Design an enzyme around this catalytic site. Structure first.
Site, PDB file in Angstrom:
ATOM      1  N   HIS B  41       0.889  -1.384  -0.199  1.00 54.46           N
ATOM      2  CA  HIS B  41      -0.035   0.242   0.372  1.00 54.46           C
ATOM      3  C   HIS B  41       1.340   1.089   0.396  1.00 54.46           C
ATOM      4  O   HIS B  41       0.358   2.554  -0.260  1.00 54.46           O
ATOM      5  CB  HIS B  41      -1.162  -0.102   0.680  1.00 54.46           C
ATOM      6  N   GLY B 143       2.044   5.429  10.475  1.00 54.71           N
ATOM      7  CA  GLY B 143       3.540   5.696   9.639  1.00 54.71           C
ATOM      8  C   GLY B 143       4.369   4.425  10.334  1.00 54.71           C
ATOM      9  O   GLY B 143       5.434   4.019  10.365  1.00 54.71           O
ATOM     10  N   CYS B 145       2.693   1.101   9.846  1.00 51.29           N
ATOM     11  CA  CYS B 145       2.955   0.148   8.656  1.00 51.29           C
ATOM     12  C   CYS B 145       4.337   0.149   7.892  1.00 51.29           C
ATOM     13  O   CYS B 145       5.436   0.549   8.161  1.00 51.29           O
ATOM     14  CB  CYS B 145       2.571   0.137   7.445  1.00 51.29           C
TER      15      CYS B 145
END
Ligand SMILES: *[C@]1(C(=O)O)C[C@@H](c2ccccc2F)n2ncc(C(=O)Nc3ccccc3F)c2N1
Ligand SMILES: *[C@]1(C(=O)O)C[C@@H](c2ccccc2F)n2ncc(C(=O)Nc3ccccc3F)c2N1
Lengths: 301, 302
Positions: B41, B143, B145
């Protein structure tokens, strides 16, 4: 979202852990620059710990009577000294992995991360609070002495604790990095009384703000209170008195949530008097006091 | 003595954390050998996450659209590929700090350490259990991920989790290091049901053994039970059924404490039916299930 008891990344401290041996005794040491710090009780045998004369015991020791090992490689001691309850074995080589560091003596109610070690090897990391009675509720087995507590400020490691003993009551005691014990504890195998422990009120309030930020608001009430009135209830429940300094420290969390510190105190007064009635806050069935306001801010931001 | 939720020392994982940027989006990556792993993503914009066509989005990306940074060292991306829900960015240099590692897909009920990171920099370490419903109850902000979960065996790091999202319900979801999600979750900004969560029965019993080793024995009773009898109570209280495999895994703790597993089950049955009566076990007023029998053995002896 989510709130967890979070330790600091331990990498900068892992690179400082060594194994220290003096006769039959093996414990952990902290190698910073050309000095290895460890509990002085490393020089004691089974028949010494009841009432050791450390000055006399250290005299019977030579620089070569201490085997220091960092991984596989053996370090050479070139000067030994005793600073309060810590032994400072000066080695001929500086630790190349020495981070930027400071030695600090923390205040009761403040938190830190413990890097639990065995035979100079790191085994795990967890967050502790220095209790108001200067004990810590850790997880330590035999061989864990010399394990350290620390905080990180960007790239600076502030070492604040060195593990020295598990008291007969199962609680843990230790020193700052200058060998000064936290609390009235001494390094001898004797029954030692820890004070009556109290709950860190400002930390409970910080954790209540952490719960509000994460969605748990059921405990917020229509009632309110005064600082002096709240302290009457706190004293009944063995909570440490709340000062204006504590209210000021809670200011940023109060501003982020729109909840006045005295209104959060009002909610806490009702949780103490009426209990939690089988409900949970942030996954806990008890009121948590091992998160400071700084821990909440840095985790939530 | 003492019992704490203890994470693995994070040093071997810290040396692998990198920052990954693709356009405006920045998250964390894991750098092992000459490959950087990160959530796919990273190639999405805010208004792409509703239903992204990852293959089409990735086609508009070239090697130079990925900026990879390890501290202040800029890495040069020489290849890119998508494997399930992870991006694998080939870089021109091997990470000199790559520890001995394996990629593992952990089972529900197993635990691991999470190194929560922001902008490629580690901020904290805590232990998590992969819930029976394949979610984790962590602490992750925007932030985070690309942050990873792992276990350590001596010198070998077994990477098991990569963080991808927080569901509207506040729980966390992610993949193994081959990009396959744990559970039915997908990488899109949509409402997603995590099933009914159940309590990891074998873990609660292991923690009851840890309590007995530490001196907490009030809950021990003069009762015994059977596997099927205990399981009728476990099904009533949303606890996972106990099998002989769980009994066998508890063997070492049963031997150390001298308490038969079916006898510990009888105590757990009484706690499920009668509650804790305002008392605590190992500093908790709840039954704890995020410690495996291994976590108990490593800490209580090790
Ligand atoms: C520490 C060492 O590693 O040398 C370990 C620590 C200890 C022991 C057992 C379980 C947990 C734990 F943290 N420890 N506690 C006490 C002592 C010690 O040297 N002397 C001693 C013995 C008994 C009571 C008090 C006391 F100071 C150690 N050694
Ligand atoms: C993660 C990233 O860092 O890019 C962060 C993560 C997140 C967001 C907010 C709070 C905690 C947290 F862990 N996250 N959740 C979802 C997503 C994402 O990219 N898209 C999205 C949005 C909402 C729900 C699902 C979903 F896939 C991220 N990105």
């Amino acid at each position: 979202s989510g709130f967890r008891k979070m330790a600091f990344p331990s990498g900068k401290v892992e690179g400082c852990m060594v194994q220290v041996t003096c006769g039959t005794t093996t414990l952990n040491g902290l190698w910073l620059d050309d000095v290895v710090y460890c509990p002085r009780h490393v020089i004691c045998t089974s028949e010494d710990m009841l009432n050791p004369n450390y000055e006399d015991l250290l005299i019977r020791k030579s620089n070569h009577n201490f085997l220091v090992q960092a991984g596989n490689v053996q370090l050479r001691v070139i000067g030994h000294s005793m600073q309060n309850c810590v032994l400072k074995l000066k080695v001929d080589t500086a630790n190349p992995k020495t981070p930027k560091y400071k030695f600090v003596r923390i205040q009761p109610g403040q938190t830190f991360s413990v890097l639990a070690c065995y035979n100079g090897s790191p085994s795990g990391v967890y967050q502790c609070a220095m209790r108001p009675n200067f004990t810590i509720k850790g997880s330590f087995l035999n061989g864990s002495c010399g394990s350290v507590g620390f905080n990180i400020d960007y790239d600076c490691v502030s070492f604040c604790y060195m593990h020295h003993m598990e008291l007969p009551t199962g609680v843990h005691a230790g020193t700052d990095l200058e060998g000064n014990f936290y609390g009235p504890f001494v390094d001898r195998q004797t029954a030692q009384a820890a004070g009556t422990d109290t709950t860190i009120t400002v930390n409970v309030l910080a954790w209540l703000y952490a719960a509000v930020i994460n969605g748990d608001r059921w405990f917020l009430n229509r009632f309110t209170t005064t600082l002096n009135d709240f302290n009457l209830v706190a004293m009944k429940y063995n909570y440490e008195p709340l000062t204006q300094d504590h209210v000021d420290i809670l200011g940023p969390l109060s501003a982020q949530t729109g909840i006045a510190v005295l209104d959060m105190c009002a909610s806490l007064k009702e949780l103490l008097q009426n209990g939690m009635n089988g409900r949970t806050i942030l996954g806990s069935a008890l009121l948590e006091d091992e998160f400071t306001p700084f821990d909440v801010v840095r985790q939530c931001s």
